[PDB]
Amino acid sequence: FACKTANGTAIPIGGGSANVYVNLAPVVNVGQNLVVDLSTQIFCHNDYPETITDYVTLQRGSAYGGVLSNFSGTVKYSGSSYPFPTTSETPRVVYNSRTDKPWPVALYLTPVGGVAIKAGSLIAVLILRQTNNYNSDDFQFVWNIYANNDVVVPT
Ligand SMILES: CNS(=O)(=O)c1ccc(-c2ccc(O[C@H]3O[C@H](CO)[C@@H](O)[C@H](O)[C@@H]3O)cc2)cc1
């Protein structure tokens, strides 16, 4: 089991850390959601699906910077939503193919004015936890999520 990003970096077998850079809607109003879709950013696969089933959770999602100070909301993981920043580990998603499969995570963030997220800033850290039905591997793939652009909340 290993993963790759839309910015051309990787995390190999056994886990590790990578940076992800997301383009964000430049304007989000109060009462609206800013969507941060990681399924277009993070892709993973199973290295031996003939015999091994991989299980993948969002272990913890943490907020930083302007997201931490100016937003609340949810994380949607494989079709169900939970508070973000997270308060539990999600259910598992199965990875059962060598073919790249998106990691089905998206943040829905709503403003609690002006530049609310600064370009280049860290907005979130998402920990992907991978186990399997084969051995006792239990690995963390740590994704540091950065904004590529400013996000403005109008008055
Ligand atoms: C080379 N001979 S073989 O066909 O029998 C063979 C080759 C590779 C493997 C192999 C076993 C464990 C592996 O472990 C990783 O990949 C798993 C499947 O994605 C993960 O569950 C593990 O955590 C680990 O990343 C990867 C490849 C097994 C058999």
Curated annotation (Swiss-Prot):
GO cellular component, one term: pilus tip
Residue ranges of the TM segments: none
Chief location bin: other
GO biological process, one term: cell-substrate adhesion
Protein's cellular compartments: Fimbrium
Superkingdom of the organism of origin: Bacteria
Keywords associated with the record: Fimbrium, Signal
Single Gene Ontology MF annotation: D-mannose binding
Family classification: Belongs to the fimbrial protein family.
Functional description taken from the UniProt entry: Involved in regulation of length and mediation of adhesion of type 1 fimbriae (but not necessary for the production of fimbriae). Adhesin responsible for the binding to D-mannose. It is laterally positioned at intervals in the structure of the type 1 fimbriae. In order to integrate FimH in the fimbriae FimF and FimG are needed.
Protein name: Type 1 fimbrin D-mannose specific adhesin
Gene: fimH
Residues of the full protein shown: 22 to 179 of 300
